């Protein structure tokens, strides 16, 4: 009697607000308690479409539990074995997501018990085998397992001695390495067109996250990957890994980590040309959260290349224009990809200097760049995050009359600082970094129009720097802003000797701009004739 009256209220509320985390979870509980367990999984399968739920730990925890219950039911074990395999795929995937969220927002214990439960899930499915969505899904999920295993190891050593950090970090390299060895999933074996994009997406995030970690650990040491595979790829490593990750007293025969064979590890270091393609493919794996982007950007500060922020944004926001003619205004409707790329460069620029300041007081007991994505803390200020989350909900046009007021003003507040307008909190060094990256990134483009856009901003920012350089040239102090969007650091204070060199670069870029326009004029008149 009561369950039915409550079912109507939940369902009628989902009519208008179908993305609420708690309201959806209460519906899953109703279907579970009312013996309609099949309809429960049917909802989670259909609610996973919404990404706001995929990012919630409470949701994935509910999807795992309800999926595990449905496997033990007769309505599943009998009705269809293909549906049984389909439900197993969803379970392995939910575990992976849940394992990711747990590592970032929980302690070492709860994450361990989950990985151990994850291990039991893999063990149970490896006997089936096959060659379909479940077989292809199982292989990719094995990589996430080892990947998250490495993330767990580095997390444990974060609060241990340095000698312990060596033993754990070495074992972590093994896990990440094994995860990178896993081949790309065969997209041909998947059923749904969305599933093909998903598994491909997850594969990229596995390679990008693991790959950058392999390099982050083997940068300081020579042939680091070789020593690891020689000593730890042996059966001794499996016993050292299992005993390290899980409670050694648990049965090792019934565990996947102990039974799995680690044969023919390529001991190959990831290539940068491949990582860039992985990062771009993994941009959507975390819904483009500013924590994910700022992390990828920080990786390339130690690597010999620039982060493909242009391709990242062009991949995230397709319809968003490159540049707006209203560079004078700060209206949030005129937001463009450059406004975002220039913003992301600032967050990465400030984030790297803040980590360095904490590291100097902490004496690099743990290198700032060497922590994995889930473990490390929030890498951006809450103000910078508020802007990104606000602009994203506006570009995607997922706003509400009760939000438009807040989302607009939160964006408009910073457009001045991004476009170097009146009272921008930009430090002279930061503006240069923008002009340098925008000039460099723009020249490498093939479309003469796209070159003009990026190189155009570089000229714009350069013009906004020169007045500040003359002031530093004359040994006159620039006014330090009040509560700037991007923190000022004295470690990058421009000095007299550097003023003349920048004035050159500025005049050069101006000429590069005129050269591009010149080639566009040649193309224009040729199209007229």
Curated annotation (Swiss-Prot):
It is found in: Nucleus; Nucleus membrane; Nucleus, Nuclear pore complex; Nucleus envelope. Transmembrane segments: none annotated. TPR repeats lie at residues 21-57, 143-175, 439-472, 504-529. Polyubiquitinated by PRKN, which leads to proteasomal degradation. Signal peptide: none annotated. It comes from the Eukaryota. It is linked to Encephalopathy, acute, infection-induced, 3: A rapidly progressive encephalopathy manifesting in susceptible individuals with seizures and coma. It can occur within days in otherwise healthy children after common viral infections such as influenza and parainfluenza, without evidence of viral infection of the brain or inflammatory cell infiltration. Brain T2-weighted magnetic resonance imaging reveals characteristic symmetric lesions present in the thalami, pons and brainstem. A chromosomal aberration involving RANBP2 is a cause of chromosome 8p11 myeloproliferative syndrome. Translocation t(2;8)(q12;p11) with FGFR1. Chromosome 8p11 myeloproliferative syndrome is characterized by myeloid hyperplasia, eosinophilia and T-cell or B-cell lymphoblastic lymphoma. In general it progresses to acute myeloid leukemia. Contains FG repeats. FG repeats are interaction sites for karyopherins (importins, exportins) and form probably an affinity gradient, guiding the transport proteins unidirectionally with their cargo through the NPC. FG repeat regions are highly flexible and lack ordered secondary structure. The overall conservation of FG repeats regarding exact sequence, spacing, and repeat unit length is limited. Part of the nuclear pore complex. Forms a complex with NXT1, NXF1 and RANGAP1. Forms a tight complex with RANBP1 and UBE2I. Interacts with SUMO1 but not SUMO2. Interacts with PRKN. Interacts with sumoylated RANGAP1. Interacts with CDCA8. Interacts with PML (isoform PML-4). Interacts with BICD2. Interacts with MCM3AP isoform GANP. Interacts with COX11. Interacts with synaptic plasticity regulator PANTS. (Microbial infection) Interacts with HIV-1 Vpu protein; this interaction allows Vpu to down-regulate BLM sumoylation. E3 SUMO-protein ligase which facilitates SUMO1 and SUMO2 conjugation by UBE2I. Involved in transport factor (Ran-GTP, karyopherin)-mediated protein import via the F-G repeat-containing domain which acts as a docking site for substrates. Binds single-stranded RNA (in vitro). May bind DNA. Component of the nuclear export pathway. Specific docking site for the nuclear export factor exportin-1. Inhibits EIF4E-dependent mRNA export. Sumoylates PML at 'Lys-490' which is essential for the proper assembly of PML-NB. Belongs to the RanBP2 E3 ligase family. This is E3 SUMO-protein ligase RanBP2. The lineage of its organism: Eukaryota, Metazoa, Chordata, Craniata, Vertebrata. The chain holds residues 145 to 673 of 3224 of the full protein.
């Amino acid at each position: 009697d009561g369950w039915n009256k409550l079912f109507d209220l939940i369902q009628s509320e989902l009519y208008v607000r179908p993305d609420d985390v708690h309201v959806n979870i209460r519906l899953v509980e109703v279907y579970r308690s009312t013996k309609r367990l099949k309809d429960a999984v049917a909802h989670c399968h259909e609610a996973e479409r919404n990404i706001a739920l995929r990012s919630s730990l409470e949701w994935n925890s509910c999807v795992v539990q309800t999926l595990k219950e449905y496997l033990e039911s007769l309505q599943c074990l009998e009705s269809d074995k293909s549906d049984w395999r389909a439900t197993n795929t969803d379970l392995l995937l939910a575990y992976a997501n849940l394992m990711l969220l747990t590592l970032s927002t929980r302690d070492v214990q709860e994450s361990r018990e989950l990985l151990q439960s994850f291990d039991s899930a893999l063990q149970s499915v490896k006997s089936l085998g096959g060659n379909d969505e479940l077989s292809a899904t199982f292989l990719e999920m094995k990589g996430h397992f080892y990947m998250h295993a490495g993330s767990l190891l580095l997390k444990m050593g974060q609060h241990s001695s340095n000698v312990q950090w060596r033993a754990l970090s070495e074992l972590a390299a093994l896990c990440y390495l094994i995860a990178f060895q896993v081949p790309r999933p065969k997209i041909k074996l998947i059923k749904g067109e969305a599933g093909q994009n998903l598994l491909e997406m997850m594969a990229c995030d596995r390679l990008s996250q693991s790959g950058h970690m392999l390099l982050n650990l083997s940068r300081g040491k020579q042939d680091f990957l070789k020593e690891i595979v020689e000593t730890f790829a042996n059966k001794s490593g499996q016993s050292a890994l299992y005993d390290a990750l899980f409670s050694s007293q648990s049965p090792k025969d019934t565990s996947f980590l102990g039974s799995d064979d680690i044969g023919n590890i390529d001991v190959r270091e990831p290539e940068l040309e491949d990582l860039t393609r992985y990062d771009v493919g993994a941009i959507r794996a975390h819904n483009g959260s500013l924590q994910h982007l700022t992390w990828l950007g920080l990786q390339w500060n130690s690597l010999p290349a620039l982060p493909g922020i242009r391709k990242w944004l062009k991949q995230l926001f397709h319809h968003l224009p490159h540049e707006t003619s209203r560079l004078e205004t700060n209206a949030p409707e005129s937001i463009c990809i450059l406004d975002l790329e220039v913003f992301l460069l600032g967050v990465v620029y400030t984030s790297h200097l803040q980590l360095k300041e904490k590291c100097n007081s902490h004496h690099s007991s743990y290198q700032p760049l060497c922590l994995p994505l889930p473990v490390c803390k929030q890498l951006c200020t809450e103000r910078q995050k508020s802007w990104w989350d606000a602009v994203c909900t506006l570009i995607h046009r997922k706003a509400v009359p009760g939000n438009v007021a807040k989302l607009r003003l939160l964006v408009q507040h910073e457009i001045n600082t991004l476009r170097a307008q009146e009272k921008h909190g930009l430090q002279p060094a930061l503006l240069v970094h923008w002009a340098e990256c925008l000039q460099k990134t723009g020249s490498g483009l093939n479309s003469f129009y796209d070159q003009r856009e990026y190189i155009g901003r570089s000229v714009h920012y350069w013009k906004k720097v020169l007045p500040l350089l003359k002031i530093i040239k004359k040994k006159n102090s620039i006014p330090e802003p009040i509560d700037p969007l991007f923190k000022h650091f004295h470690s990058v204070d421009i000095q007299a000797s550097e003023i003349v060199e920048y004035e050159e670069d500025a005049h050069i870029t101006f000429a590069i701009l005129d050269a591009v326009n010149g080639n566009i004029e040649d193309a224009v008149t040729a199209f007229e004739s």
